[model samples]
Target: PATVVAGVDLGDAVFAAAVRAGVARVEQLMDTELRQADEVMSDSLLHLFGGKRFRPLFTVLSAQIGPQPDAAAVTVAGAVIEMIHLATLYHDDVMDEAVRGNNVAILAGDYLLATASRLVARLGPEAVRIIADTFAQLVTGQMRETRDSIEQYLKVVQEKTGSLIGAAGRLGGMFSGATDEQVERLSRLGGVVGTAFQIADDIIDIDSESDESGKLPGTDVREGVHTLPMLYALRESDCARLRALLNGPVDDDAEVREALTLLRASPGMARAKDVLAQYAAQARHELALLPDVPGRRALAALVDYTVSR
Candidate 1:
């Protein structure tokens, strides 16, 4: 649910075509790259299933922003980023999966990671290096065994989510012949929007209904790993009751519901919103360097949608 990109349509035909092309390439690559000689594995690839292919679309859009846009390389880069994303999502499934099921799920993640490495290896040494560096940050972030603070949690969000997205933009632009400076700005923009995306998702976990967010309401509250308004709320002086609800993981239908309602009524909800709005504005600054196509404006439009949410 790191939901960085929104459902907004920029309505640029060329931009729409690029997105369609990227989607086709991503699907083709997934079916090709994920095939195993043996199909005996039980639901072996369930983790790869489901998603709007947001990262792939983002990569394709980014590639079009540069001076020289090479469709082939950009689509390949798009495929690479999403494969890695699915791998992590597969690995993150331990919370909902049973112990026995988790065993297969973990292996599924490793398999996807290996497959991603093989695909990315074709992109050359520099791409290899960036993906390697990005992967390291994801592992470090997943540990979450770090200090808790605004800057600290933000760092985790960046490492866990933003860095890969930044790499998506970076790789797309790099493959499409963007200038060095343009690539750098794309990475910065991706990271800023990526973290903002995480913040917005966290807020949604508290503020939205199950139907609204398209997932179980209060999933983070039940899992204990999802950080957000609760983290902000805990720092307050009147947090004793709220702290009690959040400290221990809540699975009961009634318990989770009450906690969510309480947090929505708390000041922390507004606090997180403030952070996301600032980040959305900061992401707009990264747009000056990328131009010409509807891609840049589409990216800009995605930013507009996230803040209002």
Candidate 2:
């Protein structure tokens, strides 16, 4: 069966089939976990599966590159990674002061984190260490982004987003009994891919014409969140008007539209795209370390998909 993720169809037929099988197993695992003693816990956790299963997809595919991909371990690891992702999203929503059931969000996220911790512990010592470090990175990244530097912000994105993804790749490789060198390379590949994917998402937030982004155009601008395109635009001498409009909270619709117009027309968008391409290239280069297999091809396609967005 074909599988679509984050608005892109996994068009590589072989990869899609593999991903579907893996995700089905992950879903089953999650379902069993969510059928908790508390009914509300079960109900709230159900929404976790609603998003694109990209993290798990990465884990599953990364495992396939090794000689002995443990089906059971891969499925469990995928579910564990996804649960951690869901926990972070819930925490983020609460931090953002989202009004759409913030209380429930906090509780649900806490529950997922607790559950993910328990599950990771079962995966053994190395898995436990990786997850513990990843959790630290996520919190550090989220906290670090509040500072005023673009470099720091990128670091924050890498930690909050890329670190876990790298761990996902690492878990896949380690469980599949891949060599230490191969595992490290897969980890690096995931880090690059995750960062590129996020930067591309930042661009899409500025350029998307539809609500598919789950946000309105300029939502980040209005909220004073410094995105890659906005940051690039800020550096350009010709974007005085755009800079002024972005100087404070952009609550005015007219000013938001004007800023969007200038930003789209500016060199920032192209520069941001170039940055994404650089990371994509880095990820593709890393792929060279892995064996020439169907999994490698799918991973390369993912890099292409990351930039194409």
Candidate 3:
């Protein structure tokens, strides 16, 4: 029997609240004139599905820091974060040559990128600068994706995945007036969890069904993205065979099935689980540094969710 990894059940309530808060923020920000630039912003705002599924820590932290108290500022920050996330998706899809998954076409909606820029501008040039810098990290993460080394890939994931999580946590604290110490602590916690979460996502892609992943299976192999599973497989299995399998075209279901067979028989799947568990444990340890607040509980829940998934 397959073990259902741990951590999936942890952050439910927090996730819901975070999604609601994000939608409210987007609606409010849409009222500003500057954000109205091009159909880009409007369309992007419409596609703003508040993918709360991706980042529970952001929501939990927002509620903890006081989304309820300073709703306006919190909304702006949340919307900004979401926009930044969406922009990355748009650019990532283009880079990965992705066609479908989780309302991806919403990315092409009117001046989405422009609207994001305008909204950030309303947050003040300083806010714009911060978001722009975060975008830079996203690009850097993508650039790292081109590397052949696993260590380099990890670094890319850190910048691409960890940086945004850190931003969301710090933004939550900032909106809620948390002290600098508190903000920094939360930021670090977010980074740990975010890294773990991405690693878990990679694991799922390596072994789960297309329905489970909401995308084609063996995509990492097809795209040549050396996710944790592929890396582990390379080390433990016949490297030449695995590399040849990866190097060939993956344009058909039959090809995907064959690749899946090799991956399943390899030790990479188990290795992926071990790697996810290690990171999950590290994420939990990071949360231990924070005060025992509701946010802290939510953070724990997120860690559990990642490990379980």
Best-matching candidate per lDDT:
2
Top candidate, metric TM-score: 2
lDDT tens per residue, model 3, 226-277 = 6777777777635667777777556667656667777777787787777677
Task: Sort the predicted structures by TM-score, highest score first.
Answer: 2, 1, 3
Off by over 4 Å in 2: 1-15, 47-49, 211-216
Q: Residues 107-170, candidate 2: write the lDDT tens digits.
A: 8888898889878877999898999999899889888875545677679889988999999999
Please estimate how well model 3 matches the true structure, expressed as its whole-model Cα lDDT.
Answer: 0.63
Residue pairs that clash (backbone atoms under 3 angstroms), model 2 = none
Judged by lDDT against the true structure, how good is candidate 2? 0.80
Ranking by lDDT: 2, 1, 3
All candidates: TM-score? 0.89, 0.91, 0.78
Query: Where does model 3 exceed 4 Å of error?
Result: 1-23, 26-35, 39-50, 53-60, 63-70, 101-111, 122-126, 209-216
Error of 2 at 274 (Å): 1.9
RMSD per prediction, one decimal? 3.6, 2.4, 5.3
lDDT of 1 by residue, 1-309 (tens): 122233556665555665675667777877776765157543677535546777876787688776556557787788778888888877766644522157677777777788788888889999999999999998787666344577778888889889998999899889878889889988998888778888888887776665234676687888665476777888887478778878877878887888888788888888888888788878988886676567788888767665553
